[PDB]
Amino acid sequence: IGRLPIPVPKGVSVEVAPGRVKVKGPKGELEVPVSPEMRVVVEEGVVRVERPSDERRHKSLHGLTRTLIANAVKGVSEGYSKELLIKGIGYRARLVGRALELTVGFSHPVVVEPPEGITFEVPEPTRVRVSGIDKQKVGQVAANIRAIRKPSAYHEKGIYYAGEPVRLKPGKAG
Amino acid sequence: MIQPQTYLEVADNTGARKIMCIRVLKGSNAKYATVGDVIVASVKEAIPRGAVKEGDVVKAVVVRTKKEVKRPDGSAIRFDDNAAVIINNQLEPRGTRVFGPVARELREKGFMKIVSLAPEVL
Amino acid sequence: MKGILGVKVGMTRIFRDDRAVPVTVILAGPCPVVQRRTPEKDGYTAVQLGFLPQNPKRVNRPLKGHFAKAGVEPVRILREIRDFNPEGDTVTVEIFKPGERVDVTGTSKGRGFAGVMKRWNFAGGPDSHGAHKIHRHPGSIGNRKTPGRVYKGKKMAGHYGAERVTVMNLEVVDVIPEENLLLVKGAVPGPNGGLVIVRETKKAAK
Amino acid sequence: MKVRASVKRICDKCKVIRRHGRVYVICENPKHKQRQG
RNA sequence: AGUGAGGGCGCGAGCGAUAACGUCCGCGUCCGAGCGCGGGAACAACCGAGACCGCCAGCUAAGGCCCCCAAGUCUGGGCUAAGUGGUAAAGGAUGUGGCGCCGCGAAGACAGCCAGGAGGUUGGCUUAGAAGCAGCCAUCCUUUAAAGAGUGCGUAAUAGC
RNA sequence: CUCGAUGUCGGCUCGUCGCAUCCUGGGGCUGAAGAAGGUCCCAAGGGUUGGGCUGUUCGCCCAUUAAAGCGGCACGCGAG
RNA sequence: UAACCGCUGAAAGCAUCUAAGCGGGAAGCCCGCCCCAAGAUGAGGCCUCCCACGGCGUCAAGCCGGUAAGGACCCGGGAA
């Protein structure tokens, strides 16, 4: 009824191999997990995740294999770029090539490195983020960077995802 | 050379060139009112007038007798034990005082005044 | 990074604009007496000797163990792993460059047999209000039903001199390439005019 | 915040989070860090 | 002729704090004084059981059968999965599984979605502001996406979600 | 159990484990600006001074200190 | 890895660090640091070297020389 419907457009390399499903698209040969009982098909344009039951384990498993391998696909279709925005009077940014310029620790050496699907985008640099491929590892690295200085609820000067409304509280007494 | 409890000598605005220190002002584990150091004490000896009194200051380490061994293998020993009394900051006590030169002191540095102050013979 | 030696004696010297004290290291130059090839002793390494005490005196075995890659006529020998032999004979006439940091050790001069007194710190007990043991003696050793007995590994009286050991970092100070000698300002680890060795390890980030 | 007990949520919409036998309430207000595992 | 003082367990009253391998009395068993065997790890009194002496005999208690060690790593149907097994209460909880029950307007559901979030809604005080999103209650009307006497981020009302 | 025998205090000397950790760090929280406090969960690693008076350990007081913890072992220690 | 922070994600067709799978992280845990150590009968591993030593009832795992192959003994010396 509902927790298993998805199409596999682009004629993507949509195949199941040694107990691992191989989703190959712009290159992201993404390895989407395959629980032995979940099971799925990709015929015509329709890709379906099945349920060898419906109890707790399985049902969640469904939500997963479905959503996550769904990922495998959408991903293999484009290229996974994380939109991110650096912003704060205290900070600098430029690709440098394969790292993380960055400067707001007032002893700025910030020489980072790009894991993989990770390409650096400095078009601002106020607006500035990265592109990845692997939705999981991408949101992640993004995070790594955010984390390393970003916080600031009461005074801003950080890195922000899309940049949530950053809830902020007063300083002294007024 | 050192001591905890001590009958030491001074010669600043002293009540008497003598006070008894408790211990060393250094790294919490005294045991050595040592050459060129800074420590704690009260008076032992008398004091004609003088705004000094029978109280207690802290201050800095002069002479010793049991090896003033310096960086340059400069070497010495005076058959005398005494330091200069301090007022807070360190800023020495008296206008002058009876004694003289030699590395260790100035070297500790913080007290140049003592430095130029006790120069000549004695 | 290793030197094999006959430790001489400790003495004082001067450096820059100040004196300070060193020690006399002396080593003719050990040589590839035995090699653990790895396929040989996958604990790969070099064993060498560095002098020579009388030949008329020498077990056959020794004679041929030498035979091996054949070298000379001594008796001072020992081994160390993870150290290539970019040679087949070593001296230190450069082997050990000065103005460098080193680590080193040797035999440990042989003490005696003194209790709580020696062996360990804290000089014995006290003396006066009690003299049925005057000044020092053995601390305490356990108790009633705690472990219900006598303990098993706290310091103890006696023999504590016939052993060996080493010192962490020390300075290479100076190199005398002729008389294969080097001054190093060292804890003269163990006697002198006897046996020692040096090795260098310290990826120490200050 | 934590407490080997209590926790009846709070921040008017304070979340009952299941994590490691860890009775942990999660919200949008630090005031509610409810760690009772 | 011997004990003329004894303890334990279960139930029933004391007492004690409804504490103690406490001490008081009673019904029973007990254990000594047989209570020497099984046993529960090993443990005087907790379930089994009375040993006159044999058996390189077989049926059984209790309680056991992957192994250490005799005995199915039986079959059958479940429910937990924390290692509970392998001591604990008060009490806490979108634990796990189970009821015996509630919402299904396929006049096609809920979390996810889209857009509008309607005009009198405009003081009552306070109006510096209520003109739902400042305090003392208001509980009506038209009007359609069906209607918020406006559950909520708020300041100067207000303006926006 | 112990009265055919179990040395009770205070201290000494050598201590050994423990965490409801004092200093240490790791932390979320603040009525958190900074700094600094204070509010809990994690973690014993090392560390966890001198004197004064008092036979008193506790204690009060002098001087510092990063700090100068509570306590288990017949309140460890007489075959020391 | 502790608390504590996150990524990807369902079962709770919006959400969640959370079984699934991934990461951050403590002066603490294994290592790295030195010091013991196959009497770790589960080593000995490598090097050199005397010979497979010589006589005795086969089962010769007993005798004697065998080798100074080597070492012990006594002597003489040692911060051992």
From Swiss-Prot, chain A:
Coiled-coil intervals: none
Protein name (Swiss-Prot/TrEMBL): Large ribosomal subunit protein uL6
Entry GO terms, CC: cytosolic large ribosomal subunit
Entry function: This protein binds to the 23S rRNA, and is important in its secondary structure. It is located near the subunit interface in the base of the L7/L12 stalk, and near the tRNA binding site of the peptidyltransferase center.
Assigned protein family: Belongs to the universal ribosomal protein uL6 family.
Subunit structure, interactors included: Part of the 50S ribosomal subunit.
SUPFAM superfamilies in UniProt: Ribosomal protein L6
GO biological process: cytoplasmic translation
Cited PANTHER family: 60S/50S RIBOSOMAL PROTEIN L6/L9 (PTHR11655), LARGE RIBOSOMAL SUBUNIT PROTEIN UL6M (PTHR11655:SF14)
The keyword rRNA-binding belongs to this UniProt entry's keyword annotation: yes
Record-linked InterPro entries: Ribosomal_uL6-like, Ribosomal_uL6-like_a/b-dom_sf, Ribosomal_uL6_a/b-dom, Ribosomal_uL6_bac-type
Keywords annotated in UniProt: Ribonucleoprotein, Ribosomal protein, RNA-binding, rRNA-binding
GO molecular function: rRNA binding; structural constituent of ribosome
The keyword rRNA-binding appears for this protein: yes
Pfam family, one: Ribosomal_L6
Domain of life, source organism: Bacteria
UniProtKB/Swiss-Prot annotation, chain B:
Pfam families: Ribosomal_L14
Any one biological process term the GO annotation gives: translation
Entry GO MF terms: large ribosomal subunit rRNA binding; structural constituent of ribosome
PROSITE patterns, A to Z: RIBOSOMAL_L14
InterPro entries in alphabetical order: Ribosomal_uL14 (IPR000218), Ribosomal_uL14_bac-type (IPR005745), Ribosomal_uL14_CS (IPR019972), Ribosomal_uL14_sf (IPR036853)
Keywords linked to the UniProt accession: Ribonucleoprotein, Ribosomal protein, RNA-binding, rRNA-binding
Role: Binds to 23S rRNA. Forms part of two intersubunit bridges in the 70S ribosome.
Record note on quaternary structure: Part of the 50S ribosomal subunit. Forms a cluster with proteins L3 and L19. In the 70S ribosome, L14 and L19 interact and together make contacts with the 16S rRNA in bridges B5 and B8.
Name of protein: Large ribosomal subunit protein uL14
Curated annotation (Swiss-Prot), chain C:
Annotated InterPro entries: Ribosomal_uL3 (IPR000597), Ribosomal_uL3_bac/org-type (IPR019927), Ribosomal_uL3_CS (IPR019926), Transl_B-barrel_sf (IPR009000)
GO BP annotations listed: translation
Entry-linked PROSITE patterns: RIBOSOMAL_L3
Keyword Ribonucleoprotein set for record: yes
GO cellular component, one term: cytosolic large ribosomal subunit
Any one GO molecular function term: structural constituent of ribosome
Function as written in the Swiss-Prot or TrEMBL entry: One of the primary rRNA binding proteins, it binds directly near the 3'-end of the 23S rRNA, where it nucleates assembly of the 50S subunit.
Quaternary assembly: Part of the 50S ribosomal subunit. Forms a cluster with proteins L14 and L19.
Family: Belongs to the universal ribosomal protein uL3 family.
Alphabetically ordered keywords of this record: Ribonucleoprotein, Ribosomal protein, RNA-binding, rRNA-binding
Protein name: Large ribosomal subunit protein uL3
Family annotation (PANTHER family): 50S RIBOSOMAL PROTEIN L3, LARGE RIBOSOMAL SUBUNIT PROTEIN UL3C
Transmembrane intervals: none
Gene designation per UniProt: rplC
From Swiss-Prot, chain D:
GO terms, biological process: translation
Pfam families: Ribosomal_L36
Keywords noted in UniProt: Ribonucleoprotein, Ribosomal protein
Domain of life: Bacteria
GO CC, alphabetical: cytoplasm; ribonucleoprotein complex; ribosome
SUPFAM superfamilies on file: Ribosomal protein L36
Single GO molecular function: structural constituent of ribosome
Keyword Lyase: no
Family: Belongs to the bacterial ribosomal protein bL36 family.
Name of the molecule in the record: Large ribosomal subunit protein bL36
Organism placement in taxonomy: Bacteria, Thermotogati, Deinococcota, Deinococci, Thermales
Gene name of this polypeptide: rpmJ
